[PDB]
From a paper:
Lysophosphatidylserine (LysoPS) is a lipid mediator that induces multiple cellular responses through binding to GPR174. LysoPS exerts its physiological roles through binding and activating LysoPS receptors, members of the G-protein-coupled receptor (GPCR) superfamily. P2Y10 couples almost exclusively to G12/13 pathway while GPR174 couples both G12/13 and Gs signaling. Here, we present the cryo-electron microscopy (cryo-EM) structure of LysoPS-bound human GPR174 in complex with Gs protein.
We used the single particle analysis of cryo-EM to solve the complex structure at a resolution of 2.76 Å. The density of the ligand is of high quality which allows us to unambiguously assign the LysoPS (18:0) molecule into the ligand pocket. The ligand pocket is formed by the extracellular half of transmembrane helix 1–7 (TM1–7) and extracellular loop 2 (ECL2). We noticed that GPR174 has a long ECL2 which covers the entire extracellular opening of the ligand pocket and provides an extra binding site for the ligand. The acyl chain of LysoPS extends out of a cavity formed by the middle ridge of the extracellular side of TM4,5 and snuggles the rest of tail into a groove formed by the lower part of TM3,4,5. The partially open pocket may provide a lateral entry of ligand through the membrane side as seen in LPAR620. Specifically, the serine head interacts with Y993.33, R752.60, Y792.64, and the backbone carbonyl group of F169ECL2; the phosphate group forms salt bridges with K2576.62 and R1564.64; the sn−2 hydroxyl group of the glycerol interacts with Y2466.51; the carbonyl group of the ester linkage forms polar interaction with R1564.64. Instead of the standing-up head conformation in the EDG family receptors, the L-serine head group of LysoPS is buried deep into a positively charged cavity formed by R752.60, K983.32, Y993.33, and Y792.64, making extensive polar interactions with these key residues and the backbone carbonyl group of F169ECL2. Since there is no inactive GPR174 structure available, we compared the crystal structure of antagonist-bound P2Y124, the most closely related receptor that had been solved in its inactive state, as well as the crystal structures of ML056-bound S1PR1 and ONO-97808307-bound LPAR128, with LysoPS-bound GPR174. A superimposition of the active GPR174 on the above inactive receptors shows the most notable change is the outward displacement of TM6 in the active GPR174, a signature of GPCR activation, allowing the αH5 of Gα to engage the receptor. Of particular interest, L393G.H5.25 of αH5 inserts into a highly hydrophobic cavity formed by Y2937.54, V552.40, F441.57, Y471.60, and F2998.50, a phenomenon that has never been seen in other Gs-coupled receptors.
Numbering used by the authors:
A (entry chain B): 3 to 340
B (entry chain R): 15 to 303
C (entry chain A): 12 to 64, 204 to 253, 264 to 394
D (entry chain G): 8 to 63
E (entry chain N): 1 to 127
Write the structure that this text describes.
Amino acid sequence: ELDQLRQEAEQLKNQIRDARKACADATLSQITNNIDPVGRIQMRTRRTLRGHLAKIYAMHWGTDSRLLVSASQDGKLIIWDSYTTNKVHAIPLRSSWVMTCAYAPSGNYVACGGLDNICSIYNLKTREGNVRVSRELAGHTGYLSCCRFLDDNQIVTSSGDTTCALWDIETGQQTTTFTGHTGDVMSLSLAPDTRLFVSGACDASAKLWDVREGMCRQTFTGHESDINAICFFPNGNAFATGSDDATCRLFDLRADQELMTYSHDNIICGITSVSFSKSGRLLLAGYDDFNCNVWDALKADRAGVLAGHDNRVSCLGVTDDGMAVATGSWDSFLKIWN
Amino acid sequence: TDFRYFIYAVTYTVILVPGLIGNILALWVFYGYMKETKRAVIFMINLAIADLLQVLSLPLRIFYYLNHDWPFGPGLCMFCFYLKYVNMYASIYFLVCISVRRFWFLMYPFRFHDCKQKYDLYISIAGWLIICLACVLFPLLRTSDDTSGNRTKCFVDLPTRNVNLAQSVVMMTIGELIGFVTPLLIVLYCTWKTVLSLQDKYPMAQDLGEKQKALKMILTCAGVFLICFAPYHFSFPLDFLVKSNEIKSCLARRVILIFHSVALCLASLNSCLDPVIYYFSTNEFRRRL
Amino acid sequence: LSAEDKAAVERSKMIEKQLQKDKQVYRATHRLLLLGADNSGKSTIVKQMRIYHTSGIFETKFQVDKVNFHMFDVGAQRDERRKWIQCFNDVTAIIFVVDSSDYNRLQEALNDFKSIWNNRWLRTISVILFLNKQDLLAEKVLAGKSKIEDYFPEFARYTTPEDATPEPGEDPRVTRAKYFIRDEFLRISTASGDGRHYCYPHFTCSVDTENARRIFNDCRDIIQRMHLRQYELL
Amino acid sequence: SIAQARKLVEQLKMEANIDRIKVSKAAADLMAYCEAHAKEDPLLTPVPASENPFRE
Amino acid sequence: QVQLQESGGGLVQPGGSLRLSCAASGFTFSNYKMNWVRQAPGKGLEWVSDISQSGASISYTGSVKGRFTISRDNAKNTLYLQMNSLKPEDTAVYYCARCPAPFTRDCFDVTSTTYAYRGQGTQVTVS
Ligand SMILES: CCCCCCCCCCCCCCCCCC(=O)OC[C@@H](O)COP(=O)(O)OC[C@H](N)C(=O)O
């Protein structure tokens, strides 16, 4: 019966742990102990963007490194030009409880979702000057927590019914589902090649997923509490995570182990977002105590601090030319650092 | 004069120092409340400035009343005589504004959002302007046409311009009605409606007594306003008529002069008792400082 | 400013005007969150408040003395709620409904009350408590078959308050029962409070016609107490 | 259930036969990429104020 | 990997006594608040007892308030419950539960149907 099944499972877990333990000859810090530091790094705020009425809950930058989108619970989406602080679009929603947004890589569409369990897709470039809903995807059984386009035809979602799905916009129907997680799925990150992706859940676990097969390829388990954020290192061979135990960590895909830990004893608040830099050297993170931190990714050092918000920091991101960082908080303000 | 100079000297000396301390420190503590809370104090700032200037204009008066001479010329004497009273009436204006604001947001709580404080700036400057106009009547009516006096003439020994009695009555009555009666009626009506809204047949007993403290503070503010400003405005017309040689009896002259001296000294104390009643008793000045 | 500069400026200024009209309607309306279990009668309160007029959430609108309220009810979620609850950190009030004649599930309702009261993003929000189904409680107490102190051992040592209000001439036994169950929730709300939020309890049943007036009065008290704090220095 | 424990076992079996490498090679690879692109990172090395679009 | 393994169950005659223990692994034991829950035949999950980070504040449900006792040992990473006078109504499965986050006062979702930081359970039969 199930007693034997569980005993076999425990044996296989012992085998996996020993297979990983045989591979641990060196530590990253021993390899990098002969390296110069980066010194102190100091950033300043160039623009402050004003206009929302309630807490800002998500944002996303554009491939065109100039334009931006952001979402707020008063029920609005705004599209900004960040060189001039000069609003381009403002869009009113049907439900006020939104939690995610995303640009398409071509600048033709934006998307959003939230507490009603639907994904809605907006078309900006119509012959009409107006902006109207094109699609409403309607099959999930819990709220929508993240979202990322892949092209103008296909989109990937994660929800609070503990599944992720891949969707076909022109037809409207799901094409594949990913089911193995146990708690809510909180984030999601696409690969540079768009053939793999990773996710982390309200369960101290991350999984690597194959888009085209619809299967799980690997599982990574190092944290203590719910994982709130996740992202890929630039060459496609690594990823970093941050959770409610107030730690960030770096995992490697080929070695199949945890590789570096970034923490401190004075930090006892959870982490809301993480983000990498363009050469991979700086890892930037956001926290519940109103500030953001800058770590050297190779040394577990603490090379900088960004301050200036009054309420919880909820979102953060870096552009494709690597020039500037954008942050958003429960203040209802957005800020650009460089 | 033999029973006026000394009272003025002692009173202004005592009023001098704590007014400096309170107003300066209070503007300094205001400075940090906007560096952390993105809120506006506007009527409070204008009160504090008006009180600061009024307490500032005193030392020349003290020196003159002690040494019985003025070695500086008339162009400065006129400006001091103007400055004191302009600041007094600005102070009264801002107290009335604060009273009406509290009435509004406690009597009608659903009709008061943060997009309503639109013209608080437009109010302030507007008032600060009209007063500076209407008070010019103080130095114009104090220098008599032709006299050859310019050395001892400062602050109580100035002549009085010779005027018709009927025009005197008209001007004095309009000044009493615009400067005292209207503000007092507004303040009493609004205190009456505000203390009715802070009581009800529902004590929660799980409370901390927050509505009773507010009730007591509203009553204290109204009482101090009334006591510090009523005697001066009752004694003002009699004193001006004695200065115009309209009342002849020596008894009436001596009594009226002494009484108005006392009343003016008593109305000068608000610049020191304001920083103790409006702020310096809040919880926001005792979580800072 | 050339062509593109001026056109982009004129466009962002029209957007500014429309956002100005939106702000006013947003600020003249009050949001409420409705909570309770399924043996509680929450929907009947929802239906009594309709005469004032496969989804994840439901809304009902009502108006009293020319003021507008929006009430929000959550349906079609899983039973784990430590994440979506955070969306509600700035409602005017929470409304908690409880089936008061069900002795066998009251400890679970008390555990719900504690978790809501002590959370980090919900610690400046007030609660209006409805103690529903009073005719059933009356019938049970009179019938004499079941006992309170089988579930709550301290009822044996309870005496009615002095300021109880048994006006309609009801039995003293029903009055002890009512006030004991109320004092249980008021003990939790007074233990850990800090002065920044309170609780407002009411006794009710299924044929009451006057719950919108009670909600009106309690929100008036809440908003006045908030005014006193934000504007000590005006 | 039998379905749940069976699927758990099948997944563990699928994951238990994946090829692995030593830690030092992967650490050296991350370090080599980092060193290769280190002078084109414009937040690690700030640009002159003429090239910055946010101070022109 | 977070693990909680709980033991001590079995068969008792009414009036007897019993002791249960949990061994924890994979988290820093002392930042967390700990709980005991149970499930009887034909019902749902029910909350039994409660202890906080240091052991100072304790809490019990109404029907066990004079009979059960809860404690913890942070140097050995262990949790304990002791049961003194058992009744036929105590026949159930017992589970050991953890609070979701550290340094926290509220305790959401610990009796839900699926929950990630709960163990496998132990059977207790009284007859
Ligand atoms: C809200 C309110 C506002 C409105 C405004 C209006 C205006 C009013 C109105 C006002 C009215 C007009 C009138 C005029 C009269 C003149 C006279 C004089 O002189 O005066 C002063 C008295 O008093 C007294 O004095 P001794 O005694 O001379 O002495 C002085 C001393 N020593 C100092 O100074 O120092």
